[PDB]
Amino acid sequence: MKISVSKNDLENALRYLQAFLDKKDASSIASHIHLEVIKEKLFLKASDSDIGLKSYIFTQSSDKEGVGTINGKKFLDIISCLKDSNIILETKDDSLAIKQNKSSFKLPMFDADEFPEFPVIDPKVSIEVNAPFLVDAFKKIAPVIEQTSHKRELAGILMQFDQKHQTLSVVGTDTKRLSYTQLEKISIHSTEEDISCILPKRALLEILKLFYENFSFKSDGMLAVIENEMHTFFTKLIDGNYPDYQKILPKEYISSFTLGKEEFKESIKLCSSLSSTIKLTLEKNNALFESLDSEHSETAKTSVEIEKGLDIEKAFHLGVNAKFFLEALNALGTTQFVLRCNEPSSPFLIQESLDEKQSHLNAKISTLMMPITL
Amino acid sequence: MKISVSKNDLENALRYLQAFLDKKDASSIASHIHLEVIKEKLFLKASDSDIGLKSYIFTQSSDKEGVGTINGKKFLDIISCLKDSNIILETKDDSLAIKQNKSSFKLPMFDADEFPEFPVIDPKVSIEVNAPFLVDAFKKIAPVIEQTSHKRELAGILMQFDQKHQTLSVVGTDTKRLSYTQLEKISIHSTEEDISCILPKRALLEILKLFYENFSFKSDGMLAVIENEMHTFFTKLIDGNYPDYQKILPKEYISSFTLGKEEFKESIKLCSSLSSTIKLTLEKNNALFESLDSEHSETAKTSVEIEKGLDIEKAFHLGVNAKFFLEALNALGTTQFVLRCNEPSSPFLIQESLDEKQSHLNAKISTLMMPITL
């Protein structure tokens, strides 16, 4: 091959690709990016059986078309050390030459025939995402999912597509808490009325780096493929049978309290200076927070006034996990939140104020958590 | 005790003290700060046989004088979670109560009688530092000193005081490189005409966090004590007999080249994308840099034009350690540097352009390095 490219364009493409390389063993083609010049475009890809990214940039000049490979980490280290002028890339034999003015480099290429084939699917379901609601949901739900979850299907996020009712439900859970959202009025094309894709957490995190809005999401039940103008990303899906969250959501809630989000964040952070768990006491015009989990003779307490009185006769006590409660509040875009409760020994809900109100750009995440006893 | 203090004042004092606590075992008094209220001042200290800091802040109100202790990490975690209003601190029995409005905390105190005594010295040497030259020297020399240097006295920085000639020499070395500076016109008070203090690296690093200028430095040959208005710091010294750097500095240099600092930094960083060592070739109007240490079939090269010709007939080749060379340049405040050379197999010097010129505020650091062969 022989081309010249913009330094910035190349650098940016290389940064995105770093996360799809096994960088530790440079002698393996898994540490390499595959390169292919084609009619005024350079395509860069890094792939394996589980995950991959294909990107392109435009060439500033193109002289000779072809394919090749190069160590992705070294390539990026080199480029990030160069000036902002254009970079000439040119193969020699099984070596890639890189030149910019007085600076020149060589790196070994591998046999491109060993490079994994970049899959293509024939999609069973597909959507066009024209707003940030989906990545908004991914971002807000991701904290509840542990990547090394020793149970296979909880290690990922669930995308449940309802062709019939044009809804996409997004769910994450570890076993102590569960966060979900139901996205309405989503134009779903699908061969079946119901289908569920489980994205590995690792894939979820890469998706957040690559995509925001104006992308397509397609899947054949085995791989999910996401594309916009510059990128094609894919991931293997996790086998199947995500627990149905709908069955373990409580039917009713005796108590629903509208409370101050930032005051609760501040008060919970404060008590977690000495504990992981907190005792919350709600009264008509007052919220009290006490460290619960703290070591002997270490105590942390605070309270906040509640101006618009709660519908409480005397006092409601609820033991909570401080981090989970904070992360539940972190996931909300409202200044106030609703806490829904029943018995203090039973799971409780945290959601946005006016969660029922419909929006378009953003997702509204609800979180169900198990309480701590006493 | 019973006092109130400014939240910011307290927080800042606590941050400085964190580094003088063994934080991992909270059950040990080594994790605690000692507190003592005295006539409108609160003193906070953390100390051991080797190192310590004593600080104070003014009290906003004082009601009851006394002493006590508290876990430094927990104390800071609590305070950093509070609002900016004043904080009431008040003992109860062997517990410290902390209150700010609706927020209140308790932490256990230990028997203050176990707390290490904060040393005082009768100083054999003393200086007043009214400019940043000393910490400037510390900062520039610190990178060449390895803290876990398995040789005892190279693990610290040397302060050599010449009462006679009113000079303080500061030196650091690992065995491959040595950096030094001679500070002139320093008002030294001392019982002897010559004395040397070796500061442990750990102490050096804390000093950089605490002090800049307008402080005193005193020592009794065993401890060094540094004080300004707010702080008294001390460290144990390292036993003695720092190798005399003066004997291994070359007498003369055949070649002295004035070169571009930033161009050399850029060119060296560039080649170190693929190597730790670089082959430098100086010609009359050109500097060439080639990766030396790089793996087979990985090459990095660049050059820069030298407008004001060097006094070279054909070409001078010098193998260098890239990091050491960069750190040598990092230590210089000039846009140009001088490289002094002799034989390519013999140690060479890097110093500021016009190193001989005298300054007041800043230190001028020179670095002697051993070359790499071929």
Residue numbers in the entry:
A (entry chain A), B (entry chain A): 2 to 375
Text lifted from the article:
The sliding clamp is a ring-shaped protein complex that encircles DNA with the help of clamp loader in an ATP-dependent manner, and slides along the DNA. In prokaryotes, however, β-clamp is a homodimer, with each monomer consisting of three globular domains, and in this way β-clamp displays a six-domain ring. Although β-clamp is part of the DNA polymerase III holoenzyme, it is not attached to polymerase III permanently like the other subunits. β-clamp is loaded on the DNA, by clamp loader, a subunit of DNA Pol III. In both prokaryotes and eukaryotes, a key feature of this clamp-binding motif is the presence of hydrophobic amino acid residues that bind to the hydrophobic pocket in the C-terminal region of the clamp.
In the space group C2, one monomer was observed in each asymmetric unit, which interacts with another monomer from asymmetric unit to form a dimer. However there is no significant difference observed between these two structures from different space groups, the structural alignment of both yielded an RMSD of 0.15 Å. While Hpβ-clamp was found to exist as both a monomer and dimer in the crystal, the dimer was the dominant component in solution according to a gel filtration experiment. The dimeric ring shaped structure is a biological functional unit that binds to DNA and slides along the DNA. As in other clamps, twelve alpha helices were observed to form the inner surface of the Hpβ-clamp ring, with positively charged residues suitable for binding DNA. The β-sheets along with loops were found to form the outer surface of the ring. The N-terminal region of Hpβ-clamp was found to have more electropositive residues and the C-terminal region more electronegative residues at the dimeric interface. Although superposition revealed the overall structure of Hpβ-clamp to be similar to the β-clamp structures in other organisms, but some important differences are there at the regions involved in DNA binding. In domain II, the loop containing residues 210–214 was observed to be shorter in Hpβ-clamp than in E. coli and the other homologs. Moreover, in E. coli and the other homologs, the B-factor for this region was found to be quite high, compared to that for the other regions in the protein, in contrast to the case in H. pylori. These results indicate that this loop in other organism may interact with DNA, however this shortened loop in H. pylori may not be involved in DNA interactions because of the absence of certain residues.
